[PDB]
């Protein structure tokens, strides 16, 4: 809805930064609405969904186990390791790691998982194989959140990320069981409260993943819909603002409010 585009532009004005936006029909893959769909934005922690996706494909293929336990040490600990830092002694399973990386945005959990699949280059190659020739992971946590202007490293495009997420959630790429596992993690998200979630009406379905970074970067990817089921993919990225975290949260939630309102 064009009225949503009005809010998006309003957001750019409010934040004094670029905003990338996309609304995608889950079933058909049709673009319902877009704003700078083909400009690059830093993915930040939104990439964690893609990471667990690659992990799940490995599991499906017998190359990995959800139950496998990983034993890391204090040396692996990076800033923003709310969960990992609590299990230093016993380690954590692949399952718990994906859960932490997604539901809590745990940075260490991501690096550990990155290691198991062969690093950024491997994640990148996974994406490329599934038809996404744009999205790219170049660094590890937490350097990937650098967001230097004009840098292509660790970026995606709103259209690329939307279509990729769609393939992941509804394609033949993952077994049905893995798909669900993926959705289950996004659904249990615990740090995205002040974003789309704040405008969501009761009884609606939401599976999402947020992210933040330097240079006022903030973003969210999500599958949502009325009646406990998703029917649309929404991707929102911003970068360059000198605004506070709170002001960035508000604009995102206001965009959400508009999209819901004009559903």
Annotated binding site: 209-211
For residue 166, report the phi and psi dihedrals to the nearest 5 degrees. -60, -50
Residue 93 per-residue DSSP state: E
Q: Does 105 bind ligand BJH (CB under 6 A)?
A: yes
* Helix spans in 16-157 (H): 47-60, 94-103, 107-117, 120-129
Radius of gyration of the chain (CA): 17
Cβ-contact 9, 251 below 8 angstroms: no
Task: Quote the tokens at residue 71.
Answer: 């034993």
Task: Quote the tokens at residue 46.
Answer: 């939104």
Q: Does 216 bind ligand BJH (CB under 6 A)?
A: no
The answer to whether 45 is a known catalytic residue is yes
Tell me how far, at minimum, the Cβ of 98 lies from ligand BJH, in Å.
15
Q: Does 213 bind ligand BJH (CB under 6 A)?
A: yes
Q: Does 123 bind ligand BJH (CB under 6 A)?
A: no
Between 45 and 241, name the residue whose CB sits nearer to ligand BJH. 45
Cβ-contact 48, 105 below 8 angstroms: yes
Q: Give me the catalytic one of 38, 143, 152, 214.
A: 143
Between 173 and 233, name the residue whose CB sits nearer to ligand BJH. 233
Tell me how far, at minimum, the Cβ of 189 lies from ligand BJH, in Å.
8
- Applying the rule CB under 6 A, the residues between 72 and 101 that interact with ligand BJH are 80
Give the end-to-end CA distance of the chain in Å, rounded to a whole number. 8
The answer to whether 122 is a known catalytic residue is no
H or E, element range at 186: helix 176-187
Candidates 4, 108, 145, 163: give the one binding ligand BJH (CB under 6 A).
145
Tell me how far, at minimum, the Cβ of 125 lies from ligand BJH, in Å.
20
Q: Give me the catalytic one of 23, 33, 34, 45.
A: 45
CA pair distance 141, 121, nearest whole angstrom: 14
> Which residue is at the shortest CB distance from ligand BJH?
45
- Applying the rule CB under 6 A, the residues between 153 and 212 that interact with ligand BJH are 191, 210-212
DSSP three-state, residue 174: coil
Sequence ranges of the binding site for substrate? 209-211
Task: Quote the tokens at residue 176.
Answer: 């049905």
**Residues tagged active-site:** 45, 143
Chain residues binding ligand BJH by CB under 6 A are 44-45, 80, 105, 107, 142, 145, 191, 210-213
């Amino acid at each position: 809805h064009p009225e949503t585009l009005v809010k998006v532009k309003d957001a750019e004005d409010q934040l004094g930064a670029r905003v990338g936006y996309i609304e995608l029909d889950l079933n058909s893959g049709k673009i319902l609405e877009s704003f700078r769909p083909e400009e690059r934005f830093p993915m930040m922690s939104t990439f964690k969904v893609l990471l667990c996706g690659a992990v799940l494909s490995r599991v499906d293929a017998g190359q990995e186990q959800l139950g496998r336990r990983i034993h890391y040490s204090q040396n692996d600990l990076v800033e923003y390791s709310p969960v990992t830092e609590k299990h230093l002694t016993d380690g954590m399973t692949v399952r718990e790691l994906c859960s932490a990386a997604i539901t809590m945005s745990d940075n260490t959990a991501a690096n550990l998982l990155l290691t198991t699949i062969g690093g950024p280059k491997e994640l990148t190659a996974f994406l490329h194989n599934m038809g996404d020739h744009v999205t790219r992971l170049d660094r590890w946590e937490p350097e990937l959140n650098e967001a230097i202007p004009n840098d292509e490293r660790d970026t995606t495009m709103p259209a690329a990320m939307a279509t990729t997420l769609r393939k992941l959630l509804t394609g033949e790429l993952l077994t049905l069981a893995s798909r669900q596992q993926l959705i289950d993690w996004m659904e249990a998200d615990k740090v995205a409260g002040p974003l789309l979630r704040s405008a969501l009406p009761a009884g609606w379905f939401i599976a999402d993943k947020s992210g933040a970074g330097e240079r006022g970067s903030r973003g969210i990817i999500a599958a949502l819909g009325p009646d406990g089921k998703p029917s649309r993919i929404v991707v929102i990225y911003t970068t360059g603002s000198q605004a506070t975290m709170d002001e960035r949260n508000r604009q995102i939630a206001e965009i959400g409010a508009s999209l819901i309102k004009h559903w």
